């Protein structure tokens, strides 16, 4: 979230009920962002994957509060969005059929992949398994490179 300044309106009614959870997310992100001297490239990437996961989880929590549980008012939701507590573009994808579990927006940026495809993590696990067993090899896909997503198709 963005720093509090004269531009910031007071947190709407109900913020204090959710604030402890948002503070735990903040603490986790505050530690993940640190420099940890990871020697290996693989571990280095996995440390950015933790940040992408935490960002997703915080937005997912707020999304569940507003759209699924109706536990917060629209004024609070709009404030959380304005204050960058939740990613509105990612929540916008979660509201669309077939994207209800999208890990991140980067995994659907077709323009940035070599083949113009989405990230492999969008493919339903059943289709990868069928292709692999037909081919006679195990499923080689484990975690995608942009974020450590292991599969985010709505069916999985």
């Amino acid at each position: 979230p963005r720093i509090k300044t004269r531009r910031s309106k007071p947190a709407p009614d109900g913020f204090e009920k959710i604030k402890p959870t948002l503070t735990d997310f903040e603490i986790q992100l505050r530690d993940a962002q640190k420099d940890k001297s990871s020697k290996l490239a693989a571990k280095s990437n996995e440390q950015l994957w933790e940040i992408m996961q935490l960002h997703h989880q915080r937005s997912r929590y707020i999304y569940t509060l507003y759209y699924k549980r109706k536990a917060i008012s629209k004024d609070l939701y709009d404030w959380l969005i304005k204050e960058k507590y939740a990613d509105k573009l990612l929540i916008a994808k979660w509201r669309k059929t077939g994207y209800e579990k999208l890990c991140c927006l980067r995994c659907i940026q077709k323009n940035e992949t070599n083949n113009g495809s989405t990230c492999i993590c969008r493919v339903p696990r059943a289709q990868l398994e069928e292709e692999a067993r037909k081919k006679g090899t195990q499923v080689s896909f484990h975690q995608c490179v942009h974020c450590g997503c292991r599969g985010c198709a709505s069916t999985d």
């Binding site: 996961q53 579990k101 999208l102 890990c103 993590c121 696990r125 059943a126 974020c147 292991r150 069916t155």
Partner: peptide, 25 residues
């Protein structure tokens, strides 16, 4: 092809919740 109940079952075998829940076992 799989049925919706089979998908629910398989989905619940993932070690951990959300997109990062592992399939390795």
């Amino acid at each position: 092809h799989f049925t919706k109940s089979e998908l629910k079952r398989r989905r619940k075998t993932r070690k951990g919740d959300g997109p990062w829940g592992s399939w390795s076992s």
